Design a protein around this ligand. Structure first.
Ligand SMILES: CCn1c(NC(C)=O)nc2ccccc21
Ligand SMILES: [Zn+2]
Ligand SMILES: [Zn+2]
Length: 582
């Protein structure tokens, strides 16, 4: 407790020595409270005018327009200690899973050099302003690295001074860039060296891309077994137990030298003991601590979420298969049985899953899985929107299964070849493309963000009539040579100045391991759509008067945006579609 977090707490006290006050009306039940001090401050969602001017029919669709307008009583809840049988199942499974993930990978420190390159191309690291303005500037300045050094030698000494979280079903924990560096140095290898790739982890999909996820679900569907289960957890990050954090730390058993010590310190000092600053309007800053829940960088959070979810779902499969009888207590012979299941069929059972952080699809050996709930509930991974002891409802068709906010269609090209394509309700796609984050956007930067959405649509959602037409319109309205941009950066093949038909051929034909015939597609008209009725089911406006006027008059909308941007070099992409091809 306070021996590990005191120094951090004591240091914050002194920089606010005039304001420190142990408040009596503190709202915390499950967080340990330590004190308060004076502050005052908060960026809402802005509309992208280029995308909105080229999507006029959606200006009267509330599901689109409401997206641009605008529970913290879940972070203040407490998960119970699992029972002895559960803790044993988790420890045995975690031990086995780190060994499997480590068979063909070597843990290693990530470098200042790697960190510096990351910041200089805008990956959302979850940092803050202060001393230097941005991340870009702190990294050049040698003073920073001396701060990093001080903390670093403090961590080698098993102590912490400056690794403090800042709080702000989405609760995001920013730290200062130095704290994020030390996290990345110790645990960045999990993402940087693709520990959760499908090749390496069998269940994982890290680096796979939205154009692979449907093919992966169809491959899971080919296994003999029961229904496909896709149960969401209620507030996954808030249900991570101290026992979960201790099984995650066992990755350090695979490390050596300095790295082992640096990694052990991140787990001990920042993950299994946390210090947090939360803005309370009543305006103070509260300095609160707790031992459990997930609060790491968003990229380390993804890998450890994937790890602990893989572990949980293997244990639920063991329960359905009757490998153990009760979570109260594993006998000595049950331990040997669980161990022999893992050695014997563990890799086969991992291949029956697709797991992206807290998101999973499982095709178990049979439907006993549906009612195998004791371990899942006792680990604290309580299912969303179903009663605790009500059996899971599975999906009979891989094309109906939800995964990573999508479903997947099987789409046959006029030449007989098979595409498995990502899809979601089209109101969600248009509503997200109409939103920008942050201030100070020039017209050119706003246009380049619209172009990024347009190229994503041409690559991933070409099968939706309205999105292929709107993508062509935006790419016609933005100068041909202007480079697509984003402010937070799945594989992103649309973020390129290359012709989108050439990128389509590379992604869907040449590099697609599920496509045996590699004959290139010569035009967009070879590339199919969903059925018209299926397109309407997934939110198309095809058939409406508003949509017919928009499509017919599209060159007038394109010219409105071209007139605002000014006299630049533009390409007309609309004749790539049959109906505008004369
Ligand atoms: C090398 C790949 N590539 C990119 N990619 C970018 C800008 O990331 N833009 C291109 C334009 C024409 C031809 C190839 C191109
Ligand atoms: Zn620290
Ligand atoms: Zn669909």
């Amino acid at each position: 407790n306070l021996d590990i977090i005191g120094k951090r707490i004591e240091k914050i006290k002194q920089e606010h020595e005039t304001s420190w006050h142990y408040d009596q009306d503190h709202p915390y039940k499950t967080w340990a409270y330590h004190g308060s001090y004076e502050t005052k401050q908060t960026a809402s969602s802005m509309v992208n005018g280029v995308v909105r001017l080229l999507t006029k029919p959606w200006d009267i669709i509330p599901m689109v327009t409401q997206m641009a307008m605008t529970f913290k009583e879940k972070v203040d809840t407490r998960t119970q200690e699992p029972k002895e049988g559960t803790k044993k199942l988790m420890k045995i499974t975690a031990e086995w899973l780190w060994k499997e993930l480590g068979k063909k990978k070597t843990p290693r420190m990530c470098t200042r050099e790697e960190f510096t390159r990351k910041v200089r191309s805008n990956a959302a690291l979850g940092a803050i302003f202060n001393k230097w303005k941005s991340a870009r500037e702190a990294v050049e300045d040698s003073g920073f690295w001396e701060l990093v050094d001080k903390e670093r030698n403090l961590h080698l000494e098993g102590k912490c001074e400056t690794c403090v979280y800042n709080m702000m079903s989405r609760a995001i924990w920013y730290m200062w860039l130095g704290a994020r560096f030390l996290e990345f140095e110790a645990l960045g290898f999990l993402n940087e060296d693709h520990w959760f790739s499908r090749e390496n982890s069998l269940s994982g999909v890290e680096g796979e891309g939205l154009h692979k996820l449907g093919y992966i679900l169809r491959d899971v569907s080919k296994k003999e077994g029961g229904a496909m289960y896709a149960d969401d957890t209620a507030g996954w990050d808030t249900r991570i137990t101290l026992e979960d954090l201790k099984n995650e730390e066992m990755v350090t058993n695979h490390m050596e030298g300095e790295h082992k010590k640096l990694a052990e310190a991140i787990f001990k000092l920042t993950y299994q003991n946390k210090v947090v600053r939360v803005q309370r309007p009543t305006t103070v800053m509260d300095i609160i601590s707790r031992r459990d829940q997930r609060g790491s960088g968003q990229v380390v959070t993804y890998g450890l979420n994937t790890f602990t979810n893989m572990e949980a779902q293997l244990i639920r499969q063991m329960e359905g298969e009757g490998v153990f009888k009760s979570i109260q207590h594993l006998t000595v012979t049950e331990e040997i049985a669980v161990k022999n299941w893992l050695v014997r069929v563990g890799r086969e059972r991992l291949s029956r899953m697709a797991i992206s952080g807290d998101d999973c699809v499982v095709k178990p050996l049979d439907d006993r899985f549906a009612s195998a709930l004791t371990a899942l509930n006792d680990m604290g991974k309580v299912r969303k929107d179903i009663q605790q002891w009500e059996p899971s409802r599975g999906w009979n068709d891989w094309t109906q299964v939800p995964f990573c906010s999508h479903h997947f269609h099987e789409l046959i090209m006029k030449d007989g070849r098979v595409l498995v394509v990502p899809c979601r309700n089209q109101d969600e796609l248009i509503g997200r493309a109409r939103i920008s984050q942050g201030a100070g956007w020039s017209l050119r930067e706003t246009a380049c963000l619209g172009k990024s959405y347009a190229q994503m649509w041409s690559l991933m959602y070409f099968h939706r009539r309205d999105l292929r037409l709107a993508a062509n319109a935006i790419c016609s309205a933005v100068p041909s040579h202007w480079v697509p941009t984003s402010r937070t950066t799945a594989t992103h093949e649309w973020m390129t100045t290359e012709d989108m038909l050439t990128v389509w051929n590379r992604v869907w034909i040449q590099e697609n391991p599920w496509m045996e015939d590699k004959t290139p597609v010569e035009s967009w008209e070879e590339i199919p759509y969903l059925g018209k009725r299926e397109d309407q089911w997934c939110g198309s406006l095809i058939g409406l008067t508003s949509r017919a006027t928009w499509a017919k008059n599209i060159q007038t909308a394109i010219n409105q945006v071209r007139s605002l941007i000014g006299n630049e070099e533009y390409t007309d992409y609309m004749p790539s579609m049959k109906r505008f091809r004369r």
